[PDB]
UniProtKB/TrEMBL annotation:
Its EC number is 1.11.1.-. It catalyses: 2 Fe(II)-[cytochrome c] + H2O2 + 2 H(+) = 2 Fe(III)-[cytochrome c] + 2 H2O. It is found in: Mitochondrion intermembrane space; Mitochondrion matrix. Residues 99-289 form the Plant heme peroxidase family profile domain. Heme b binds at R45, W48, H172, K176, H178, N181, S182. Destroys radicals which are normally produced within the cells and which are toxic to biological systems. This is Peroxidase. The chain holds residues 72 to 362 of 362 of the full protein. Forms a one-to-one complex with cytochrome c. Signal peptide: none annotated.
């Protein structure tokens, strides 16, 4: 199963920068969403969920085919809430209908990370929409009520190692859980890309509690929460070392996240030898927009 990147006909860096800018401007405009968090976090989660269906063993799933647009994937219980991200991206797609669905979903995550003052995430175009029967079945995204061993094994399927896993989980500094979506009770939330997930894990006074959906979660006196899979990163000695590293080195975290997140978004894609180099988009701020 080979998915070869194919650049949208006639498109170059400037075309994609325009798409980035449209997403970025809408992010700024639609600021009231989810109690003033805005759509950044849900767009990062969307980019991850469209990518996290990948299976290294047979190259099924992954971002390439844009298959989240189809009902089977769109209605995955693991994707509850992501319809908000899809609806946010709808007018962007209508404006720039030349871009593939995989490219738009993945670019949405990149743009969200950067606009939320995260690292630059190099991004490559050329994902090609594939037909409805290429949609992966539900059940490939991870459970949150599990331990470090489950997290480690799960991420092997996505060819991610311990450092990559701990780095990617740092995205949980963004946004919040919603009881109605996932059965987890939201805590204190923000919409700035930082290493604060790791600081919270290490510095907070955590207590294990059972929420109103009957799921266990870790809650702090300060009003923050962690999923059991989040908290596993301080229960496992290997994960713990890396949590400490990122809590104490913002730059290292930024750089490692950027690599891991680009890799997540590119898993399953074969880039031809003469494909364009990855693009690094300018933020609205860098452009004076
Ligand atoms: C073991 C791995 C993971 C599990 C079990 C997990 C689970 C969850 C759950 C249950 C939520 C709450 C959904 C809701 O109620 O709306 C959530 C939110 C989120 N997740 Fe993860 N996640 C994992 C890995 C990741 C990774 C790798 C990324 C990105 C790199 C990510 C980004 C997010 C973001 C940005 C949100 C907030 C969405 C919002 O505010 O609407 N997650 N995740
Ligand atoms: C999802 C969203 C926000 C979070 N904060 C801590 N764990 C999280 C999971």
């Amino acid at each position: 199963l080979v998915h070869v990147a194919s650049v949208e006909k006639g498109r170059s860096y400037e075309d994609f920068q325009k798409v980035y800018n449209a997403i970025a401007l809408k992010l700024r405009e639609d600021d009231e969403y989810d109690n003033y968090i805005g759509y950044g976090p849900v767009l990062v989660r969307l980019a991850w969920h469209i990518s996290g269906t990948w299976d290294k063993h047979d190259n099924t799933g992954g971002s390439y085919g844009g298959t989240y647009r189809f009902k089977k994937e769109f209605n995955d219980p693991s994707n509850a809430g992501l319809q908000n991200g899809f609806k946010f991206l709808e007018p962007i797609h209508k404006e720039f209908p030349w871009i593939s669905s995989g490219d738009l979903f993945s670019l949405g995550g990149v743009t969200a990370v950067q606009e939320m003052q995260g690292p630059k995430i190099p991004w490559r175009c050329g994902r090609v929409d594939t037909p409805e029967d290429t949609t992966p079945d539900n059940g490939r995204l991870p459970d949150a009520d599990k331990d470090a061993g489950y997290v480690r094994t799960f991420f092997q399927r996505l060819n991610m190692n311990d450092r990559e896993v701990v780095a990617l989980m740092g995205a949980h500094a963004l946004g919040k859980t919603h009881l109605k979506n996932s059965g987890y009770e939201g805590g204190g939330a923000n919409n700035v890309f930082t290493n604060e997930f790791y600081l919270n894990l290490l510095n907070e006074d955590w207590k294990l509690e059972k929420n109103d959906a009957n799921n266990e979660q870790w809650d702090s006196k300060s009003g923050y929460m962690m999923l059991p899979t989040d908290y596993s990163l301080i229960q496992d000695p290997k994960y713990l070392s890396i949590v400490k590293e990122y809590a104490n080195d913002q730059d290292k975290f930024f750089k490692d996240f950027s690599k891991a997140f680009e890799k997540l978004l590119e898993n399953g894609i074969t880039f031809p030898k003469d494909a364009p180099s990855p693009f690094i988009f300018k933020t609205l701020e860098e452009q004076g927009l």
